[PDB]
Amino acid sequence: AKAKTRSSRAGLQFPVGRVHRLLRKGNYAERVGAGAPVYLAAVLEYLTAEILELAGNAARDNKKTRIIPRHLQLAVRNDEELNKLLGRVTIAQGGVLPNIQSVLLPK
């Protein structure tokens, strides 16, 4: 019959076949379960959607139609769980969160 993508069968956008091939060639274990690449692609797609949503919100707040690394940095650092996840991750041209200590403020 006609070829149908496993992502379509799982209703995903991430390529399950590519994930399975990379898992096989990644020297992680001798055998790979059939339901493994689907699970991994689903988790990756969910995380991608989450951070893309936050970045799009940030870009809109800047009245810009395209997400820039600054938007990504702002979204990641503003989201507590996302910031904790990428604790040791450095984003190029991401800048820093605008934050000034209270005692340095004029009084």
């Binding site: 799982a10 898992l23 274990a29 991994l40 989450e50 997400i67 690394p69 996840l85 984003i91 190029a92």
Partner: protein
């Protein structure tokens, strides 16, 4: 030669969440780097788990445990839900 990436899939996800928002090349490069990082982290943790229990096969249970160990709280819960739903849908289909 040709080098593969995640550009098309990330683009489709973006069009799903923000059907009007564009993106720059540096942003999707960062996207691909992040995707690869997460992939390697989860796969390495799953391989470590499989070796821990003296098993030659990596199943979806291993990935579930790895995600529970690597993601904090609500992100882990939601990702577990997504993976379970996708697995059930694919098996039913």
């Amino acid at each position: 030669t040709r080098k593969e990436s995640y550009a098309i899939y990330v683009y489709k996800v973006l069009k799903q969440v923000h059907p009007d928002t564009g993106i720059s090349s540096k942003a999707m490069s960062i996207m691909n780097s992040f995707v690869n990082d997460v992939f390697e982290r989860i796969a390495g943790e799953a391989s470590r788990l499989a070796h821990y229990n003296k098993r030659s096969t990596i199943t979806s249970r291993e990935i579930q445990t790895a995600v529970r160990l690597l993601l904090p709280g609500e992100l882990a819960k939601h990702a577990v839900s997504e993976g379970t739903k996708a697995v059930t849908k694919y098996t039913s289909a």
